[PDB]
């Protein structure tokens, strides 16, 4: 099979993995202003749920949930996940 495979002819960017350059947003995220990730202290025990498996803990788990169920992605797939229509305008 001559063809198709080994896909880029141009090259570019081809770092060592990764020598500080994919930065952030424009680091424009600072401490998500709640700082959050950096005010927590002892503890740190918070996020949006569902994230992991999560089974069997503290009270039995059923189906219908987020498991099996999937033979193809089919329509309605998620990838970036941004809104944002209320910002660099209303702060307060």
Not at 30 to 50: G, H, P
Not at 69 to 89: F, Y
Request: glycine share 0%.
């Amino acid at each position: 099979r001559k063809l198709e495979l080994t896909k880029a002819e141009k090259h570019v960017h081809n770092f060592m993995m990764d020598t500080q350059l994919t930065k952030r947003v424009k680091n424009a995220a600072a401490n998500v202003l709640r700082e959050t990730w950096l005010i927590y202290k002892n503890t740190k025990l918070v996020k949006k749920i569902d994230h992991a498996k999560v089974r069997k803990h503290q009270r039995k788990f059923l189906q219908a949930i987020h498991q099996l169920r999937s033979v193809k992605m089919e329509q309605r797939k998620l990838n970036d996940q941004a809104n944002t229509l209320v910002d660099l305008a209303k702060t307060q």
